[PDB]
Design a protein around this nucleic acid. Structure first.
Ligand SMILES: Nc1ncnc2c1ncn2[C@H]1CC[C@@H](COP(=O)(O)OP(=O)(O)OP(=O)(O)O)O1
Ligand SMILES: OC[C@H]1O[C@@](CO)(O[C@H]2O[C@H](CO)[C@@H](O)[C@H](O)[C@H]2O)[C@@H](O)[C@@H]1O
Ligand SMILES: [Mg+2]
Ligand SMILES: [Mg+2]
Lengths: 556, 412
DNA sequence: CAGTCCCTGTTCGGGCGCCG
DNA sequence: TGGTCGGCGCCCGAACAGGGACTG
């Protein structure tokens, strides 16, 4: 019985018909070797590590990185080849806790487990595959080979095994203490109660004894008796919370990697700081080869970056969640398919903020994007609070009613009210349901030659108006749109248009206000200027009316 | 202490790995309460991350129930068990069930908990319970018995089920019973009161065998279809005839006897859309002959047991929805319309959800299958809301389509 | 009646940010 | 020195699916 057993282990098979890792160690510099050898030798006395005879035919590289904000070093074993061949697990970490989720508590304790990975036993049969060879100051001394007796940093089964093991240990305590809140994220524990501060600390220490029984040690050094607590990158105060300060690079010359950090920082910032915009900064990253390449900032990304920094200038903070009061989400349109939102309960006291900028579709409008933002907020809210907020939306009740009733897709927004904060979201134009009496009827068509990429777009009308236009470097689709554009240009404020293009009719009937295609944008521009447009569809090549005549013209 | 029937996945197919989606606080609370009791009774037990399979779980309230029902989305598992519940232990379909004046649906899901489940198979029934704001990691379980909503459950229990049924079946030979997953379809031609009474008898009959039943009533004979219809107009504008020709031309992919020649003649010029066009006698007769053909059935449309059912739905506005069930394109086994459903004029998603359920129910009664739905909705819109309005114990297959409607062929 | 080409939308893996 | 794991978020681009129109 050379090694003791502390807590229940997790069976871990290899992927079937596959064998343990073999790969030679790195040429590690002696400076790192000093740090590694001292800690690694200590492990054997505890029982974390064991010596192995050459009967163990497995070798895997090893390396070390300094603990951030500490002099200590972190001991990590590269298991990339072992991961590849190790059985798949099901991750039990389904997301990240957000402080806006937290309810107010009278007493809050944050405590961190020490050597959390090294306090959880690895599977006995699986221990052999860990084997790695230590290095020496010279290449003469071989260095001992070691197999882990506990979870090792760098494996792919470590987080899930620890989290599941931690939950099993915590579960008896929680059942005995139904009114204690324990937020368990990896080894960090957040403990909150409405118990008075003296009684709360009694439970806190009593919980520490419970974790001690299973070999889990909570050092005082990482204990956080007193606010403001540092938790998941946030600063927690009795009645408010905020993000730990974010440093934005100041570089005078920006590379590609530069913008990524910036962008990724601003996304983290936008959870509380209202109105962060990354659109123009992200425009710089599209279709670039090298992460190292240097790129100059446009006057758009510069102006953007300027007001983004100024938002960070003033300190902001969020509040906590009061289950008694309603949840309210308000959304503002920021232009260029950019939307920001605030979730709150008391007016002007925000739980959190956020943005929805995703451009979805080649042709779209503001109503679709607002519906997308509402959905993104709803799912986010259900994660954090388990309910859907009431919505305050910058869209008239009649605008929304007109859109969803007429749209051919099922669409819906949950309970919401109108807020009159401009810019309001509206439909820029409306297609007529019935043909317009006394309006000129334009029969439009276009065709193009697949080989030459040459084509014609034209129309014929009941009044005798006619046009045919030659086009270069086009497609059948593009000429069918062009024909419609021509009819809109050359018509009065009211016009009936008959097309046989399903492509064009589908784009235009969805009432888009923005498009990737400039041609569609120009069609939109004209539709907005009209008083009445009736679009109608007929099947091609059926000998119908004007459609037959215009088909002949453009085919020529 | 019952023998456990061994089960295997379809060859070359691994188990389901499907992430758990976020749940509302009420559903999470209901699931935690439901699973706590189920663990104490031994139906499920907690499991570790070493199991690499997961299936989504959530809770529903059946129509008017007010009492939460656990529901597992086993579609992925059921697809990987598929050969089992078809090739071997499957159920025949009573072609007469659709003919009965009344059909009641009973939730016998509880019965499945009696039988135990093959120890080797339980690794595939894993499901994770989420926590609000990720306070805790996911609490994983797996099934020790026959799970509700799995397609092996009614097949393994069919031997047990028939013996319980058999005294009741002998007492009433005429009555027809069909079993689809957790549900028992009981179709009688009796009068309403006698019918309801016999259901209580089959309830008690189920009770003395140890089964609780928490009544969905159908009248499959009332069910009708929705024919393609052509408008009746005193006068026709050029636009009306253009719409009519387009609708008829599309219809000719279904009824090959449709002819547009005489109706096309009416639009030879280049005419204003609102210009009134008198119909000729030749066009009147062509239009008359067409309306008759549309009353007729399509030639050679018959159900094929091998082929999958496909359902398409269209949103017609004003609370009206149209659907077509088929296996081959343009060979439609049924076409229908739904109006004034729950959520009409206020919620498209609630209405679409109700529509999917009704269509699936009809397919179960008529063919003992569930169709694959082509849903006229955006993937993110459907996934966000659909569980809120779901009141059935099964879950059909669906895909998402965005077809703008050139012509309103199915509706008017 | 296949086979393309347009055109659109989805998915998935890459980078970064953040948390252990 | 360059180098590990899991989770979540964003924004990207490439690779893939599929529906119509048209070409033989
Ligand atoms: N860069 C990384 N790579 C792999 N695993 C990591 C990691 N960073 C954290 N983890 C995982 C590994 C375990 C856990 C590390 O948390 P602590 O930083 O607190 O190190 P601990 O062992 O707890 O020492 P203590 O300071 O508590 O005494 O998260
Ligand atoms: O609806 C899309 C959604 O399907 C998931 C589960 O939410 O897959 C399930 O539903 C599909 C469509 O019916 C089935 O084909 C599939 O077998 C079933 O597991 C998602 O991962 C996907 O986003
Ligand atoms: Mg720690
Ligand atoms: Mg044409």
């Amino acid at each position: 019985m050379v090694p003791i057993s502390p807590i229940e282990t997790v069976p871990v098979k290899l992927k079937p018909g596959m064998d343990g890792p073999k790969v030679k160690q790195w040429p590690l510099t002696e400076e790192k070797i000093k740090a590694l050898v001292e800690i690694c030798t200590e492990m054997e006395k505890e029982g974390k590590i064991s010596k192995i005879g050459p009967e163990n035919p497995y070798n895997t590289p090893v390396f070390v990185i300094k603990k951030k904000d500490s002099t200590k070093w972190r001991k990590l074993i590269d298991l990339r080849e072992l991961n590849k061949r190790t059985q798949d697990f099901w991750e039990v970490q389904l997301g990240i806790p957000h402080p806006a989720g937290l309810k107010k508590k009278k007493s809050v304790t944050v405590l961190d487990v020490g050597d959390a990975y090294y306090s959880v036993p690895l599977d006995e049969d699986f221990r052999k595959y860990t084997a790695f060879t230590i290095p020496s100051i010279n290449n003469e001394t071989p260095g001992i080979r070691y197999q882990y007796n506990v979870l090792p940093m760098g494996w792919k089964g470590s987080p899930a095994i620890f989290q599941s093991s931690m939950t099993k240990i915590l579960e008896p305590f929680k059942k005995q203490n139904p009114d204690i809140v324990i937020y368990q994220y990896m080894d960090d524990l957040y403990v909150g109660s409405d118990l008075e501060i003296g009684q709360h600390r009694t439970k806190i220490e009593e919980l520490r004894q419970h974790l001690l029984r299973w070999g889990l040690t909570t050092p005082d050094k990482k204990h956080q008796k007193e606010p403001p607590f540092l938790w998941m990158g946030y600063e927690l105060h009795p009645d408010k919370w905020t993000v730990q300060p974010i440093v934005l690079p100041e570089k005078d010359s920006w590379t590609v990697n530069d913008i990524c950090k910036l962008v990724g920082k601003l996304n983290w910032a936008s959870q509380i700081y209202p109105g962060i915009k990354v659109r123009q900064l992200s425009k710089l990253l599209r279709g670039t080869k090298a992460l190292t390449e240097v790129i100059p900032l446009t006057e758009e990304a510069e102006l953007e970056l300027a007001e983004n920094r100024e938002i960070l200038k003033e300190p902001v903070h969020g509040v906590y969640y009061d289950p008694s009061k309603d949840l309210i989400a308000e959304i503002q349109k920021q232009g260029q398919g950019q939307w920001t939102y605030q979730i709150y309960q008391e007016p002007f006291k925000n739980l959190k903020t956020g943005k929805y900028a995703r451009m979805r579709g080649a042709h779209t409008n503001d109503v679709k994007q607002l519906t997308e933002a509402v959905q993104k907020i709803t799912t986010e809210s259900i994660v954090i609070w388990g309910k859907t907020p009431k919505f305050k939306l910058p869209i008239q009740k009649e605008t929304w009613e007109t859109w969803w009733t007429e749209y051919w897709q099922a669409t819906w927004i949950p309970e919401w009210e109108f807020v009159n904060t401009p810019p309001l979201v509206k439909l820029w134009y409306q297609l007529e349901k019935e043909p317009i009496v006394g309006a000129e009827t334009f029969y439009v068509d276009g065709a193009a030659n697949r080989e030459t990429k040459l084509g014609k777009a034209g129309y014929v009308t009941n009044k005798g108006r006619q046009k045919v236009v030659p086009l270069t470097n086009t497609t059948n689709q593009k000429t069918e749109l062009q024909a419609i554009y021509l009819a809109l240009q050359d018509s009065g404020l009211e016009v009936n248009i008959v097309t046989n293009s399903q492509y064009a009719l589908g784009i235009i009937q969805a009432q888009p206000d923005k498009s990737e295609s400039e041609l569609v944008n120009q069609i939109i521009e004209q539709l907005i200027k009209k008083e009445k447009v009736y679009l109608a569809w007929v099947p091609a090549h059926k000998g119908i009316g004007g459609n037959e005549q215009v088909d002949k013209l453009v085919s020529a | 202490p019952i023998e456990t029937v061994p089960v295997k996945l379809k060859p070359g197919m691994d188990g389901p790995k499907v992430k758990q989606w976020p749940l509302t606080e009420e559903k999470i609370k209901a699931l935690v309460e439901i699973c706590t009791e189920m663990e104490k009774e031994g139906k499920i037990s907690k499991i570790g991350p070493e199991n690499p399979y997961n299936t989504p779980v959530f809770a529903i309230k059946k129509k008017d129930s007010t009492k939460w029902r656990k529901l597992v989305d086993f579609r992925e598992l059921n697809k990987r068990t598929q050969d089992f519940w078809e090739v071997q232990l499957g159920i025949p379909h009573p072609a007469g069930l659709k003919k009965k004046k009344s059909v009641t649906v009973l939730d016998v899901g509880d019965a499945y908990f009696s039988v135990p489940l093959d120890e080797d198979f339980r690794k595939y029934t894993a499901f994770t319970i989420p926590s609000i704001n990720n306070e805790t990691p996911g609490i994983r379980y797996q099934y020790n018995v026959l799970p509700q909503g799995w397609k092996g459950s009614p097949a393994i229990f069919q031997s047990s089920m028939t013996k319980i049924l058999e005294p009741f079946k002998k007492q009433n030979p005429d009555i027809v019973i069909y079993q689809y997953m957790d549900d028992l379809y009981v179709g009688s031609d009796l009068e309403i009161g006698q019918h309801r009474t016999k259901i209580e008898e089959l309830r008690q009959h189920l009770l003395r065998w140890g089964l609780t039943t928490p009544g969905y009533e159908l009248h499959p004979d009332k069910w009708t279809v929705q024919p393609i219809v052509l408008p009746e107009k005193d006068s026709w504008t050029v636009n009306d005839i253009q719409k009519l020709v387009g609708k008829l031309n599309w219809a000719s992919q279904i009824y090959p006897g449709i002819k547009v020649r005489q109706l096309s003649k009416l639009l030879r010029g280049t005419k204003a859309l609102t210009e009134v066009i008198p119909l000729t006698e030749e066009a009147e007769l062509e239009l008359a002959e067409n309306r008759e053909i549309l009353k007729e059935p399509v030639h050679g449309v018959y159900y094929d047991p091998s082929k999958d059912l496909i359902a398409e739905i269209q949103k017609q506005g004003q609370g009206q929805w149209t659907y077509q069930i088929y296996q081959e394109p343009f060979k439609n086994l049924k076409t229908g319309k739904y109006a004034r459903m729950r959520g009409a004029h206020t919620n498209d998603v609630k209405q679409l959800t109700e529509a999917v359920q009704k269509i699936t129910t009809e397919s179960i009664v008529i063919w003992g299958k569930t169709p694959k739905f082509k849903l006229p909705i955006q993937k993110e819109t459907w996934e966000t809301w659909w569980t809120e309005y779901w009141q059935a114990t099964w879950i059909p297959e669906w895909e998402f389509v965005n077809t703008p409607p050139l012509v309103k062929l199915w509706y008017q």
